[PDB]
């Protein structure tokens, strides 16, 4: 199980975050998906983090 | 070196032709699509066929490939 788990933190001030997995060996750059934040009820950019 | 098996998945037809069903009830549980969704019948992600409307379920053969279809008529 080389694939490891990461946390996607909303660009907004809200503390809401998503959790997923990625492979650092093949795709080491950050992940910048655009997801829905229910605290602010808007779609915002989510940044990868621990 | 044998002796392994998997728990049975209890597939098969749950509702047979000519009996009324409620909307959302499972009609057929299948791995592939042995029966294809017809009228007022929806297909799930696992190829499960469920009723999208209330009525009587019937089976029929249609298409150039004589593939089996399940439909529901509001009766």
């Amino acid at each position: 199980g080389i694939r490891e788990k990461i946390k996607l933190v909303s660009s907004a001030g809200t503390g809401h975050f998503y959790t997923t997995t990625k492979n650092k060996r093949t795709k080491p750059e950050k992940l910048e998906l655009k997801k829905f934040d229910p605290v602010v009820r808007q779609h915002v950019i989510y940044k990868e983090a621990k | 070196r044998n002796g392994r098996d998997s728990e049975a998945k209890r597939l098969g037809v749950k509702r047979f032709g000519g009996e009324s069903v409620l909307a959302g009830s499972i009609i057929v549980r299948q791995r592939g699509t042995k029966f294809h969704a017809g009228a007022n019948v929806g297909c799930g992600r696992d190829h499960t066929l469920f009723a999208k409307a209330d009525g009587k379920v019937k089976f029929e053969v249609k298409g150039p490939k004589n593939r089996k279809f399940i439909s529901i008529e509001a009766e």
Binding site: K5, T19, T20, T21 | -
Partner: protein, 64 residues
């Protein structure tokens, strides 16, 4: 002597109006990344104790 309530049971079941019991679902503690949101969402609300194990619950907490 009076019966002793099973303290562990009293922390997991709450009695309701019609004599039933509500409990928290038992699969929403950890290892949550690999779980679909649909399954986690359905486990959030409290659920009623099944009939088969209701008799066991009655014995554990005869006072509550």
């Amino acid at each position: 002597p009076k019966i002793k309530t099973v303290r562990g049971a009293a922390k997991r079941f709450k009695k309701t109006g019609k004599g039933g019991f509500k409990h928290k679902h038992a699969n929403l503690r950890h290892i949550l990344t690999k779980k679909a949101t649909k399954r986690k969402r359905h486990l959030r609300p409290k659920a009623m104790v099944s009939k088969g194990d209701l008799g066991l619950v009655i014995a554990c907490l005869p006072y509550a």
